[PDB]
Design a protein around this ligand. Structure first.
Ligand SMILES: *[C@@H]1O[C@H](CO)[C@@H](O[C@@H]2O[C@H](CO)[C@@H](O[C@@H]3O[C@H](CO)[C@@H](O)[C@H](O[C@H]4O[C@H](CO)[C@@H](O)[C@H](O)[C@@H]4O)[C@@H]3O)[C@H](O)[C@H]2NC(C)=O)[C@H](O)[C@H]1NC(C)=O
Ligand SMILES: *[C@@H]1O[C@H](CO)[C@@H](O[C@@H]2O[C@H](CO)[C@@H](O)[C@H](O)[C@H]2NC(C)=O)[C@H](O)[C@H]1NC(C)=O
Ligand SMILES: *[C@@H]1O[C@H](CO)[C@@H](O[C@@H]2O[C@H](CO)[C@@H](O)[C@H](O)[C@H]2NC(C)=O)[C@H](O)[C@H]1NC(C)=O
Ligand SMILES: *[C@@H]1O[C@H](CO)[C@@H](O)[C@H](O)[C@H]1NC(C)=O
Ligand SMILES: *[C@@H]1O[C@H](CO)[C@@H](O)[C@H](O)[C@H]1NC(C)=O
Ligand SMILES: *[C@@H]1O[C@H](CO)[C@@H](O)[C@H](O)[C@H]1NC(C)=O
Ligand SMILES: *[C@@H]1O[C@H](CO)[C@@H](O)[C@H](O)[C@H]1NC(C)=O
Ligand SMILES: *[C@@H]1O[C@H](CO)[C@@H](O)[C@H](O)[C@H]1NC(C)=O
Ligand SMILES: *[C@@H]1O[C@H](CO)[C@@H](O)[C@H](O)[C@H]1NC(C)=O
Ligand SMILES: *[C@@H]1O[C@H](CO)[C@@H](O)[C@H](O)[C@H]1NC(C)=O
Ligand SMILES: *[C@@H]1O[C@H](CO)[C@@H](O)[C@H](O)[C@H]1NC(C)=O
Ligand SMILES: *[C@@H]1O[C@H](CO)[C@@H](O)[C@H](O)[C@H]1NC(C)=O
Ligand SMILES: *[C@@H]1O[C@H](CO)[C@@H](O)[C@H](O)[C@H]1NC(C)=O
Ligand SMILES: *[C@@H]1O[C@H](CO)[C@@H](O)[C@H](O)[C@H]1NC(C)=O
Ligand SMILES: *[C@@H]1O[C@H](CO)[C@@H](O)[C@H](O)[C@H]1NC(C)=O
Ligand SMILES: *[C@@H]1O[C@H](CO)[C@@H](O)[C@H](O)[C@H]1NC(C)=O
Ligand SMILES: *[C@@H]1O[C@H](CO)[C@@H](O)[C@H](O)[C@H]1NC(C)=O
Ligand SMILES: *[C@@H]1O[C@H](CO)[C@@H](O)[C@H](O)[C@H]1NC(C)=O
Ligand SMILES: *[C@@H]1O[C@H](CO)[C@@H](O)[C@H](O)[C@H]1NC(C)=O
Ligand SMILES: *[C@@H]1O[C@H](CO)[C@@H](O)[C@H](O)[C@H]1NC(C)=O
Ligand SMILES: *[C@@H]1O[C@H](CO)[C@@H](O)[C@H](O)[C@H]1NC(C)=O
Ligand SMILES: *[C@@H]1O[C@H](CO)[C@@H](O)[C@H](O)[C@H]1NC(C)=O
Ligand SMILES: *[C@@H]1O[C@H](CO)[C@@H](O)[C@H](O)[C@H]1NC(C)=O
Ligand SMILES: *[C@@H]1O[C@H](CO)[C@@H](O)[C@H](O)[C@H]1NC(C)=O
Ligand SMILES: *[C@@H]1O[C@H](CO)[C@@H](O)[C@H](O)[C@H]1NC(C)=O
Lengths: 126, 52, 57, 109, 121, 124, 121, 121
């Protein structure tokens, strides 16, 4: 099992995008996914002010700059991987479809409809 | 929380790391990996910007 | 012999509109119902239910 | 109520029949005519229930049926151990729930 | 004790003592419209069930004993299995194909009863 | 094997009262309807009273209807029969029995499955 | 057989066997609002009729026999003409001017009945 | 005579003859939404009270005599004071702390009654 960095695509696809402190970061994760089988690791990041949200075209926003210095601390709680595929498998970071980030939280829930009427045989007569 | 590649600030698995997919043998599908422990990541923009 | 009951604990899969609730935001501000400080959860004994996260509306 | 005043008898191995006669708005219309066995000094035991059915634990020497307003109990391979009083009863509807007939003494010869 | 749907895994006769538990749980402009639609629907669904009980002669009841005989073709089981072994979810599946037939029969026997009661007055 | 054990006094004056009781074991008490049946010292059986499994419905034979009360307590597995007024005609063996009715959501009985030994009551 | 309003041209006693047929048929933001208004109204109209039957003592019934005498001044016709010759549309026109009087009388006789029934308990 | 709430200052037994008077009074897109919300709410409130009467066995009635005994701890007064001296507004204050207890008891006695009635059929 091998890990590899992302394949070519747009910045929003190949990097780790996140919004923190009010600014939009695009970090290079090639330092995390570079191994066979299995201090700190420093990931460089780029910053953008003009943001096209989701996968829409035609509606851009400008993110005002944030004064001062930004510091963020967060928890990585999971990964989105795509399998590249006869004795080995390669996994690469994936993403770009936001539904995958909510599917991971809503997986435990189901919605059902209540149907309160029913009939059954009993031993009585009106 | 909006992000790519790494999922941030979500919930954790109760006992073990779990692999979930629509079809694990289909290379066209994504695999969601849920950790049972967090990995802490510290990000910064070390530039004292001003606004006008 | 036929007896009619109303209030029977039976359900079917369904798709509906859910509402948001919450305890200057982009998302949930005033168009969101205040939450219940003591929300309920009821364990269902002897109930097996099929779930499918990939078809979850 | 229900009636059958005579004693009943026969030798071991001979069958005997015990009748139970009631009325139409009683035994005729309701198919709920049980039979009970009682040895003197003891509590009754259920032998037949509904009309033809017997409880588990009751031997197949005991069977029964009804026709018109009369029910009957049949004992086949009569034993000396069958010397007991036998009673019939019936569900007589709501209001008058149960009635019983007089018992008949079975004598084995 | 148990709350809403707590008896869902219980047998049919263990359940059916909790009927009031479930009965009581049935009760930015675009966002507001979506919520009204949800509320209007809950009301309409409630009323359709009440109307239906009404035409069958079961208005105001949670348990309503009717005068329609049970057809062995709908379910050939004895009371012991239905009320002491099965749950309501299992039962609903077992007789799904006969629900509309049963409902039609209930409506008709009530129409006949309702007219006989007029003639007797 | 199940047991029904009648207890209670066997001798009272006419015009008085008497309470009989019956302890049950070996079966779920709460699942069955129960009744009392009399046996006259020299005659047959007579039905006196019937109570529902839940204790809510009671029925009596006309001859004791304004005098006797049948009661049940499912937490102690017991029946009771409270006699009042008492007549010489009430002298009998009183048997505790299981059966008699039904629960309407279960197959009917309308017969008695089990009998106790019988309490003997004399009215002087 | 006949569906909704199929009996509209039938005589009054030929009709009135189809009461459940009609009873069951009573159940872009601006566009959405118009539709909610239509649905809310259907519910409100339904409930007003049900409330009215309730106060007259006819809740849950399609045919309700009351204790108010018929005044010959409302319609001086015999049962043969009313039930075997006339239709419900014709009848509604014939007694339109007395509808509110009749409704008031029905409410009052129920209030009197409801109190007498309390005193007897 | 009196219209809506006219009997509000009358004694409890002077009032309670006017029950139908009050019962009948219960029935730009953003502006339109506010009005639908008002109408939907009136319907939902109405239905909750009707459901509650239904589970207590009082469906279709304005006066419903039940089988729950009155506890002297709820209000230690005789009928003369309650019905001839007090008004309904005063009464509501006096027993506010017991309302939920009473409602729970009413639901339970109906469940017991409803089952006994099934066993007798
Ligand atoms: C994952 O979860 C963590 C923990 O909840 C979360 O980190 C939090 O981010 C917020 C926003 O970046 C931090 O809140 C800021 O803290 C600084 C501390 O001095 C304050 O000055 C900030 O307030 C200013 O900015 C506000 C923006 O509108 C103004 O309204 C306000 O007036 C001030 O100008 C603000 O409070 C928060 O402290 C951290 N939490 C911790 C423990 O550091 C993290 O961002 C989440 N990750 C992702 C990707 O969402
Ligand atoms: C992400 O970081 C890696 C290394 O930190 C960058 O990799 C370099 O890419 C150039 C492109 O031709 C190569 O010539 C270098 O040899 C690479 N270095 C290593 C160590 O592999 C990578 O380009 C960065 N990604 C982006 C999108 O900038
Ligand atoms: C990263 O995950 C840890 C572990 O879940 C979070 O810390 C926990 O927060 C909950 C909140 O109720 C506490 O009850 C736990 O005791 C905390 N655990 C520990 C070990 O401290 C932590 O807050 C998460 N970080 C972020 C940024 O969400
Ligand atoms: C992945 O690593 C290779 C190493 O040569 C690099 O060329 C490629 O650009 C990396 N992918 C991204 C998105 O940086
Ligand atoms: C990947 O691992 C090799 C191992 O020698 C290392 O040289 C290379 O720099 C690593 N790539 C990244 C992006 O860190
Ligand atoms: C990660 O685990 C592997 C397991 O073989 C080990 O060889 C490797 O050196 C480890 N890396 C670090 C940084 O400890
Ligand atoms: C998940 O569990 C179900 C249980 O039947 C199994 O069929 C399915 O293939 C499992 N999914 C994966 C990815 O193994
Ligand atoms: C899973 O993917 C493989 C890949 O070809 C496919 O053949 C298989 O049918 C898929 N599973 C299902 C249930 O469709
Ligand atoms: C990352 O590690 C480097 C190593 O010197 C350190 O200087 C830097 O401040 C660290 N960044 C964060 C966000 O902690
Ligand atoms: C950023 O500039 C402000 C301007 O007053 C100053 O107070 C602050 O300390 C500076 N921050 C850093 C990290 O130098
Ligand atoms: C679940 O099944 C067990 C099996 O006997 C039963 O005892 C239990 O009561 C059932 N759950 C409920 C809520 O009745
Ligand atoms: C019972 O069901 C069968 C098939 O639906 C039908 O032919 C039969 O007429 C029904 N029984 C009666 C008495 O109607
Ligand atoms: C009811 O059906 C079940 C299963 O077929 C059977 O075990 C039971 O004996 C039947 N009822 C009676 C009369 O015992
Ligand atoms: C029904 O429940 C009883 C309870 O013991 C059990 O013995 C019986 O086997 C069950 N029957 C079925 C078919 O579930
Ligand atoms: C109902 O009809 C469907 C049609 O396929 C059939 O599969 C199902 O078994 C039927 N249900 C019963 C229990 O008759
Ligand atoms: C229409 O009028 C004719 C005249 O006799 C009648 O027979 C027919 O049944 C009427 N239509 C309906 C629907 O009854
Ligand atoms: C019948 O109607 C007339 C006019 O509306 C009225 O004067 C008369 O009092 C009514 N009959 C009775 C008995 O009230
Ligand atoms: C009823 O009225 C009609 C038309 O006036 C008349 O023909 C008919 O004879 C009347 N009823 C009787 C008693 O025949
Ligand atoms: C009423 O219908 C009968 C049916 O034959 C007809 O003879 C009679 O003339 C009709 N009367 C009126 C006035 O319509
Ligand atoms: C009802 O009143 C109107 C008032 O003009 C009158 O025209 C009509 O004939 C009246 N209807 C009847 C049948 O009394
Ligand atoms: C108001 O109080 C007086 C005091 O006796 C009473 O007579 C009167 O009827 C009361 N008002 C109403 C509406 O009853
Ligand atoms: C009456 O109320 C008191 C206190 O609420 C309670 O202790 C008592 O049990 C009630 N009476 C009865 C007979 O339940
Ligand atoms: C009822 O209570 C009032 C006030 O305590 C008292 O005046 C009245 O006499 C009582 N009822 C009777 C029996 O008179
Ligand atoms: C109740 O009303 C009567 C009417 O005269 C009055 O005499 C009595 O004092 C009143 N009691 C109280 C306490 O209001
Ligand atoms: C109800 O409870 C409140 C709690 O403060 C108390 O003030 C009030 O007097 C109580 N009402 C009655 C009449 O018991």
């Amino acid at each position: 099992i091998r890990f590899a960095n992302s394949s070519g695509g747009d910045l929003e696809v190949t990097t780790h995008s996140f919004n923190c402190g009010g600014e939009f970061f695009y970090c290079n994760t090639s330092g995390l996914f570079n191994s066979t089988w299995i201090d700190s690791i420093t990931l460089p990041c780029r910053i953008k002010q003009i943001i096209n949200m989701w996968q829409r075209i035609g509606q851009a926003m400008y993110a005002p700059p944030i004064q001062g210095v930004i510091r963020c601390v967060s928890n990585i709680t999971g990964l989105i991987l795509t399998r590249d595929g006869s004795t080995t498998e390669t996994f690469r970071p994936g993403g770009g479809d936001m539904r995958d980030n909510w599917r991971s939280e809503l997986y435990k829930y189901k919605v059902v409809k209540i149907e309160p009427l029913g009939v059954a045989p009993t031993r009585c007569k009106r | 929380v909006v992000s790519t590649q790494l999922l941030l600030n979500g919930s954790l698995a109760e006992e073990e790391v779990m692999i979930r997919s629509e079809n694990i043998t289909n290379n066209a599908k994504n695999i969601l990996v849920q950790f049972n422990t967090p990995v802490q990541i510290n990000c910064t923009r070390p530039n004292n910007n001003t606004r006008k | 012999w036929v007896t009619v009951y109303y209030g029977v604990p039976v359900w079917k899969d369904a798709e509906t509109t859910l509402f948001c609730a919450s305890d200057h935001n982009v998302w949930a501000t005033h168009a969101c119902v205040p939450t219940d400080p003591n929300p309920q959860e009821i364990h269902l004994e002897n109930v097996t239910e099929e779930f499918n996260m990939w078809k979850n509306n | 109520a229900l009636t059958q005043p005579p004693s009943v008898s026969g030798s071991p191995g001979q069958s005997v029949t015990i009748s139970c006669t009631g009325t139409s708005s009683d035994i005729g219309s309701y198919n709920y005519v049980s039979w009970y066995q009682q040895h003197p000094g003891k509590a009754p035991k259920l032998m037949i229930y509904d009309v033809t059915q017997r409880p588990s634990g009751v031997s197949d020497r005991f069977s029964g049926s009804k026709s018109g307003n009369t029910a009957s109990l049949t004992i086949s391979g009569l034993q000396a151990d069958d010397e007991a009083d036998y009673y019939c009863s019936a569900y007589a509807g709501r209001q008058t729930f149960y009635i019983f007939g007089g018992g008949t003494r079975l004598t084995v010869l | 004790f148990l709350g809403f749907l707590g008896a869902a895994g219980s047998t049919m006769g263990a359940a059916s003592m909790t009927l009031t538990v479930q009965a009581r749980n049935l009760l930015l402009t675009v966002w507001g419209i979506k919520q009204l639609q949800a509320r209007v629907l809950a009301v309409e669904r409630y009323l359709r069930d009440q109307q239906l009980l009404g035409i069958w002669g079961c208005s105001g009841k949670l348990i309503c004993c009717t005068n329609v005989p049970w057809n062995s073709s709908w379910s050939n089981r004895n009371l012991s299995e239905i009320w002491d072994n099965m749950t309501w979810l299992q039962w609903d599946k077992e007789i799904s194909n006969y629900t509309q037939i049963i409902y039609g029969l209930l409506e008709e026997s009530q129409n006949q009863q309702e007219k006989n009661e007029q003639d007797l007055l | 094997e199940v047991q029904l054990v009648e207890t209670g006094g066997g001798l009272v004056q006419p015009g008085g009262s008497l309470k009989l009781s019956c302890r049950a074991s070996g079966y779920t008490f709460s699942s069955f309807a129960m009744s009392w049946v009399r046996q006259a010292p020299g005659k047959g059986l007579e039905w006196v009273s019937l109570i529902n499994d839940r204790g809510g419905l009671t029925f009596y034979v006309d001859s004791v209807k304004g005098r006797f009360t049948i009661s049940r307590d499912n937490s102690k597995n017991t029946l009771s029969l409270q006699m009042h007024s008492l007549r010489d005609g009430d002298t009998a063996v009183y048997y505790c029995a299981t059966g008699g009715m039904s629960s309407a959501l279960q197959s009917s009985k309308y017969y008695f499955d089990f009998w106790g030994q019988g309490a003997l009551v004399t009215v002087s």
